[PDB]
Amino acid sequence: DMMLEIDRFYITLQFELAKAMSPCIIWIPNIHDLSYLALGLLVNS
Amino acid sequence: YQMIEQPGTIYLRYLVDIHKKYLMNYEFNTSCLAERRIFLAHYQTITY
Amino acid sequence: DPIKTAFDRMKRVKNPPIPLKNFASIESMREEINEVVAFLQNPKAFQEMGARAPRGVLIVGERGTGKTSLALAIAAEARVPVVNVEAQELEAGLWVGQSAANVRELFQTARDLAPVIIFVEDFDLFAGVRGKFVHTKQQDHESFINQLLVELDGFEKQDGVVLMATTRNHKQIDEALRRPGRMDRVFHLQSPTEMERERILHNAAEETMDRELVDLVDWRKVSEKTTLLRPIELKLVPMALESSAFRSKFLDTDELLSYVSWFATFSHIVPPWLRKTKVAKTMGKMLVNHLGLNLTKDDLENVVDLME
Amino acid sequence: AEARVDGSTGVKFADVAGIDEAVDELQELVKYLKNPDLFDKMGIKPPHGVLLEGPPGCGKTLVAKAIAGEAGVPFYQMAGSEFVEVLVGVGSARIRDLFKRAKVNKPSVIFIDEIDALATRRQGINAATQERETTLNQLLIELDGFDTGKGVIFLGATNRRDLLDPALLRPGRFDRKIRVRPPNAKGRLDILKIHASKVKMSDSVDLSSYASNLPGWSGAKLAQLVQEAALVAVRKTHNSILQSDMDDAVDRLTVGPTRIGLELGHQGQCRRATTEVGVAITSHLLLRYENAKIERCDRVSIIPRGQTLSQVVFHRLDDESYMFGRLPQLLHRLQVLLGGRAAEEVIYGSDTSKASVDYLSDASWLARKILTIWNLENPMVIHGEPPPWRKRPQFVGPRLDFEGSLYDDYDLVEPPVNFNMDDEVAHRSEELISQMYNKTVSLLRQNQTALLKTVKVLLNQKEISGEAIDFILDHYPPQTPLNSLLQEQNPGSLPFVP
Numbered sequence: 069d070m071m072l073e074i075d076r077f078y079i080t081l082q083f084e085l086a087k088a089m090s091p092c093i094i095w096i097p098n099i100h101d102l103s104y105l106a107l108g109l110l111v112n113s
Numbered sequence: 114y115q116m117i118e119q120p121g122t123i124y125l126r127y128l129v130d131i132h133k134k135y136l137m138n139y140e141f142n143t144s145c146l147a148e149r150r151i152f153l154a155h156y157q158t159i160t161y
Numbered sequence: 162d163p164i165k166t167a168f169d170r171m172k173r174v175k176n177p178p179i180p181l182k183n184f185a186s187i188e189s190m191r192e193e194i195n196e197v198v199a200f201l202q203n204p205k206a207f208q209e210m211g212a213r214a215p216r217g218v219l220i221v222g223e224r225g226t227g228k229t230s231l232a233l234a235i236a237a238e239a240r241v242p243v244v245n246v247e248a249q250e251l252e253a254g255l256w257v258g259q260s261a262a263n264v265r266e267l268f269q270t271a272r273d274l275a276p277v278i279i280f281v282e283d284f285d286l287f288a289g290v291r292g293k294f295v296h297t298k299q300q301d302h303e304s305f306i307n308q309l310l311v312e313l314d315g316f317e318k319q320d321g322v323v324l325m326a327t328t329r330n331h332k333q334i335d336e337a338l339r340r341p342g343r344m345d346r347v348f349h350l351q352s353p354t355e356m357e358r359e360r361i362l363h364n365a366a367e368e369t370m371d372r373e374l375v376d377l378v379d380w381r382k383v384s385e386k387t388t389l390l391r392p393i394e395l396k397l398v399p400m401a402l403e404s405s406a407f408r409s410k411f412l413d414t415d416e417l418l419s420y421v422s423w424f425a426t427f428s429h430i431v432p433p434w435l436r437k438t439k440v441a442k443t444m445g446k447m448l449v450n451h452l453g454l455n456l457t458k459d460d461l462e463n464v465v466d467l468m469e
Numbered sequence: 470a471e472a473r474v475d476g477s478t479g480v481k482f483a484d485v486a487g488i489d490e491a492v493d494e495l496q497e498l499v500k501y502l503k504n505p506d507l508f509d510k511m512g513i514k515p516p517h518g519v520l521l522e523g524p525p526g527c528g529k530t531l532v533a534k535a536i537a538g539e540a541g542v543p544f545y546q547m548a549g550s551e552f553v554e555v556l557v558g559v560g561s562a563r564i565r566d567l568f569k570r571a572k573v574n575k576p577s578v579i580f581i582d583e584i585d586a587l588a589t590r591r592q593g594i595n596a597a598t599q600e601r602e603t604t605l606n607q608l609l610i611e612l613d614g615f616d617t618g619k620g621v622i623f624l625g626a627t628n629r630r631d632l633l634d635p636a637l638l639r640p641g642r643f644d645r646k647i648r649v650r651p652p653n654a655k656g657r658l659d660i661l662k663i664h665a666s667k668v669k670m671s672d673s674v675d676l677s678s679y680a681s682n683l684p685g686w687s688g689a690k691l692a693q694l695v696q697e698a699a700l701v702a703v704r705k706t707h708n709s710i711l712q713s714d715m716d717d718a719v720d721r722l723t724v725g726p727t728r729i730g731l732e733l734g735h736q737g738q739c740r741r742a743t744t745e746v747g748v749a750i751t752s753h754l755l756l757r758y759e760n761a762k763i764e765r766c767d768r769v770s771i772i773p774r775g776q777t778l779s780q781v782v783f784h785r786l787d788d789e790s791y792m793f794g795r796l797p798q799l800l801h802r803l804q805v806l807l808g809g810r811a812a813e814e815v816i817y818g819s820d821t822s823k824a825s826v827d828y829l830s831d832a833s834w835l836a837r838k839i840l841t842i843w844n845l846e847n848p849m850v851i852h853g854e855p856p857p858w859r860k861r862p863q864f865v866g867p868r869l870d871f872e873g874s875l876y877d878d879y880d881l882v883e884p885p886v887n888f889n890m891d892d893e894v895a896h897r898s899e900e901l902i903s904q905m906y907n908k909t910v911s912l913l914r915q916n917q918t919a920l921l922k923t924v925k926v927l928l929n930q931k932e933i934s935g936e937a938i939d940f941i942l943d944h945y946p947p948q949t950p951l952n953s954l955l956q957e958q959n960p961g962s963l964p965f966v967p
Binding site: 091093 | 135
Binding site for chain 2: 370371373403404405407408412413414417418420421422424425428436437441442444445446448449452454456
């Protein structure tokens with residue numbers, strides 16, 4: 069239950085930072101790699 | 114690199130340039146007759 | 162705790178995007194829709210009369226028919242709060258049996274506020290037929306579906322909660338979940354008919370674009386051109402018609418960017434009475450005439466018989 | 470581990486029906502649990518464990534609960550999948566604790582459901598495999614260490630005996646292996662009576678007909694049938710389950726529920742009607758003229774149901790006629806299979822369709838099984854061939870289970886060496902198929918008014934019965950002219966009221 073917390077905190081900090089320095093252009097290479105936490109993050113975003 | 118040769122990077126440059134001027138934030142007007150037609154023609158001339 | 166973060170997302174629906182009176186292909190089962198709505202607005206009324214209230218309603222159809230909008234219209238007619246629970250939080254893929262406690266908490270917090278709606282989209286992805294998954298995706302799914310079955314079989318406890326679930330095909334759901342008592346009503350939404358399409362398209366013509374261009378369009382041809390579409394596409398048809406009609410003339414890009422940017426910038430300062438003044442109404446007309454952007458009937462006629 | 474120690478399980482042998490052979494066999498264990506000293510004085514060693522093998526829904530757990538209730542002994546029920554965890558060694562500890570608890574309360578009955586989850590064979594075709602092996606070894610050690618005079622009876626239920634470890638099948642661990650067969654017609658009748666005793670029933674429902682007309686149905690399936698009929702009666706606001714509710718539930722389980730106005734054009738529907746009516750008419754004519762030992766067409770429908778656009782319900786004959794399939798019976802069944810394409814040829818001329826090729830497949834295989842596998846003709850063959858296409862025996866589609874199955878070779882195939890005998894066999898098969906096709910076309914062409922009248926009646930009503938087809942055949946003798954049918958006011962009308 070610790071890896072999930074680390075990943076969730078990391079991705080929420082990524083999205084909060086991307087909000088903070090708006091406007092911003094986000095590049096996401098190799099989306100074929102994606103696991104459930106990031107899918108939920110992107111669906112919610 | 115004449116104008117006709119590549120439409121994809123041209124559309125990408127249009128997207129970036131419209132992104133540059135905060136022009137998504139004024140997404141649409143719903144105005145009486147003129148601003149709507151101008152934005153409609155602009156929306157068409159982006160994609161084709 | 163996914164349950165509490167999902168239950169933080171209540172939405173007291175009052176104005177649906179597509180109302181039930183405007184929704185198409187629903188008249189063949191609208192009696193069951195009204196019965197479900199009557200149960201939701203007063204679960205005690207269904208309690209006192211003793212008949213089995215509809216505990217579950219499944220809506221099936223194609224991607225885009227407005228199944229979520231149909232659920233929103235039903236809830237707005239019912240005036241009951243809804244919760245949008247996604248498929249991701251249900252399948253907590255870290256411990257075996259966490260979905261059991263998840264669905265138990267969801268049902269417990271639903272009973273504490275019932276009558277409510279538990280709305281799930283893409284119900285086919287996680288609650289499909291058993292046995293199709295082979296590698297380590299059986300025990301957790303079996304426990305989840307067993308907890309669902311034991312929660313839908315509440316022994317005459319009509320709290321007032323119903324499960325608005327969305328699937329794409331009727332076969333993919335498990336047969337044990339297809340039985341009545343657990344799954345009471347089934348709404349099959351496939352495609353609108355010609356005259357319903359005509360009415361929805363004319364409403365879209367009235368609510369989206371310039372009204373003065375509505376009469377010049379032969380909407381019968383347009384309705385015969387959009388037969389395989391869905392009500393949201395019937396709403397977005399006039400946008401594409403105006404775009405493709407403005408496509409016909411020979412015009413440049415940069416002037417349209419210039420005017421778009423100018424009207425974007427200087428719409429923040431101008432007064433509203435000056436915006437709607439008749440002088441402003443006659444300003445737009447010769448602005449259009451000077452730009453040569455006069456949209457005509459024949460342009461859109463050639464457009465509509467040009468599309469597929 | 471909450472192994473439920475129930476003083477009375479609530480299930481006795483009166484609640485078990487149609488499993489009478491296994492009940493008679495397990496009465497010995499019930500007696501041993503009653504007076505173990507009687508077995509002790511005779512020097513009789515009771516079995517260490519008993520394997521209940523069979524299809525799911527046959528009530529093996531119900532049978533074990535009945536044994537425990539009749540014996541009046543503690544009953545420790547647990548599933549095998551509950552012994553499979555992530556931490557290695559927990560399942561062996563649970564096995565030891567369960568056996569210790571059973572040994573404390575003697576006499577007792579231990580029951581392990583789905584033992585194939587633990588005793589999966591090491592097939593040669595994570596640490597979970599090691600954990601399963603350790604738990605299975607612990608179970609073997611516990612079973613081997615049992616003294617017979619301690620009065621503890623072990624039962625293991627399984628649905629797949631092929632997946633079981635042969636070590637457990639050795640004597641001393643599973644001494645008795647009892648096969649729980651599906652209930653017979655009398656057994657299904659008794660099960661239906663038991664399940665209908667719990668729900669308000671109408672006197673018009675005849676349970677014997679549904680017991681006879683649903684072969685292979687388990688007791689759980691009959692309970693689901695009764696529950697679905699009760700649900701239909703609730704939906705139809707009936708005070709009791711009528712015979713119509715029974716028929717609706719039967720049709721829902723067999724061919725599925727009816728759709729809502731999902732119909733294709735008239736062109737693609739008349740073809741299916743022609744195929745099904747031609748098959749039914751050919752079967753009825755073969756019954757009428759040559760007294761064939763074939764099945765009977767009960768009803769024909771063209772309304773889509775489940776995933777089938779059309780259906781012909783066929784009444785299944787008794788199994789005693791399903792073993793000695795003679796050459797005339799197989800030839801008549803080949804004629805029945807070819808009757809669909811015969812109807813397409815005599816009705817729609819030389820422009821046939823795809824809807825009659827499927828039957829044309831089965832006949833094209835069946836004659837091969839006449840010539841190679843069964844070797845019924847008498848130029849003897851040297852080798853058989855396997856079916857290139859395999860189709861499962863099923864519902865309203867044609868029987869193809871006259872010898873148990875159609876697409877199942879009984880391991881009688883050999884690879885060929887000489888290739889001339891192969892073309893000789895192909896020539897003989899083509900000759901037989903062409904001869905039977907010509908015969909069924911000649912038979913169907915002699916009765917055109919009855920076939921066309923049945924097609925029109927089925928196209929109008931969307932359903933027809935076998936007795937209606939028989940009445941059409943009686944009212945239309947052979948060699949009547951077509952103007953008699955074409956001069957009627959309404960061809961799709963039947964004056965018979967069942």
